[PDB]
């Protein structure tokens, strides 16, 4: 199922890392809140569902820390926008959380006396379902159609791309011993150290620890560690190689799918009558749409947002009327004649006016 076991994580720039900007391993690149009930799909530099070697562990996260895929659980990771979120599940680069609304999504965990963090600006937006604009959903109500980022991590159609990585610069591979430069590639992972100042060097230090004369300082030669075995995503925060980078295709999990969501239902309005008139006392809990029309050529669609107890004296005719208060159904009204008078004058001026 997880066939991309051959895709490794990366360190990527983040504006905030608890001390200025850094190259965090929990960097964020996409936050999708186009769904309804607070759920959100995030796209990290870290991976989920694998372990440091590549086997299928469960609810853990894996990340590069300067060369090395470490491994934490997810009950130590905490992500919050304005209030805390609730991480629902994870898969590959993609994390499904259940967040509230805010301007900025933050994602931090703990190491031995080191909080790692990334706080990026993205409007995470709680998009209510229905005509009852709420903020936190209710214990009860009526079911309505909704689009949510679903727990299903199958290949539901959409794919992303994994490229060949980029030569990662590492100033730790080099040292001065004593007056001339010396590079140490770690464990057979080769290096492409390039030198300068009169004798510009290529290099393929395949399995050795090659000393360089013609150099005296450490900032003069930059070491480039070459992995080129594990593939990576088309990140704007990683350099690319030369020839042809496109090696394969990933599948994005937690796609926006359909279902049903329990939306609230407004309190029952109070309906007083009158000649050609309907008076409505409205007492909401949360803000509610009032959508009203007539049922002739000039329907007079009136669309109001009520956030406070309201009184609305509507005009109503023999041609019809329709009233929609929250997620209730439409209640249709028609009028008939109790004009103030007896023809057998004050009558025939109300009924059939303009005369």
């Amino acid at each position: 199922f997880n066939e991309y076991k051959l895709t490794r994580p990366y360190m990527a720039r983040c504006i905030r890392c608890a001390v200025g900007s850094c190259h965090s391993p929990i960097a964020i690149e996409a936050v999708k809140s186009d769904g309804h009930d607070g759920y959100v799909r995030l796209q990290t530099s870290s991976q989920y569902g694998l372990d440091s070697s590549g086997n299928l562990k469960g609810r853990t996260m894996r990340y590069d820390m300067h060369g090395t895929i470490k491994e934490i659980p997810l009950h130590q990771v905490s992500l919050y926008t304005s209030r805390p979120c609730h991480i629902v599940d994870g898969h590959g680069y993609f994390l499904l959380a259940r967040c509230p609304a805010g301007d900025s999504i933050t994602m931090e965990f703990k190491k031995d006396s080191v909080r790692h963090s990334c706080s990026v600006p993205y409007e995470v937006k709680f998009n209510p379902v229905g005509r009852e604009l709420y903020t936190h959903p209710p214990e009860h109500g009526v079911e309505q159609a909704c689009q949510v980022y679903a727990h299903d991590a199958q290949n539901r159609g959409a794919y992303v791309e994994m490229h060949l990585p980029g030569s990662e610069v590492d100033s730790s591979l080099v040292s001065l011993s004593g007056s001339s430069v010396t590079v140490t590639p770690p464990d057979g992972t080769s290096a492409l150290v390039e030198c300068e100042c009169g004798g510009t060097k290529i290099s393929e230090t395949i399995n050795k620890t090659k000393q360089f004369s013609q150099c005296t300082k450490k900032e003069q030669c930059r070491a480039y560690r070459l992995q080129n075995d594990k593939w990576v995503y088309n990140s704007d925060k990683l350099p690319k190689a030369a020839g042809a980078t496109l090696k394969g295709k990933l599948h994005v999990p937690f796609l926006l799918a359909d279902g049903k969501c329990t939306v609230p239902l407004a309190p029952e309005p109070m309906i007083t009558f009158g000649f050609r008139s309907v008076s409505l006392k409205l007492h909401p809990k949360n803000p509610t749409y009032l959508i009203t029309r007539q049922l002739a050529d000039e329907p007079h669609y009136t669309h109001e947002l009520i956030s406070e107890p309201a009184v609305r004296n509507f005009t109503v005719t023999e041609k019809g009327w329709e009233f929609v208060w929250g997620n209730h159904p439409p209640k249709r009204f028609w009028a008939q004649e109790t004009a103030p008078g007896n023809p057998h004058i004050t009558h025939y001026y109300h009924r059939y006016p303009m005369s």
Binding site: D34, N234, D236
Partner: protein, 49 residues
Amino acid sequence: SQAGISYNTIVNRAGYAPLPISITPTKIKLIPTVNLEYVTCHYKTGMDS
């Protein structure tokens, strides 16, 4: 064209009796013919490396 209003009327030949006819339209549809031009959805900015 109105639902619920049970129309009623009688056929009246001469030598034969009245035949009643009761017609209640339950659902009056209006199905346009439709042609799809395009679909538009959110975008994603693809930043090559």
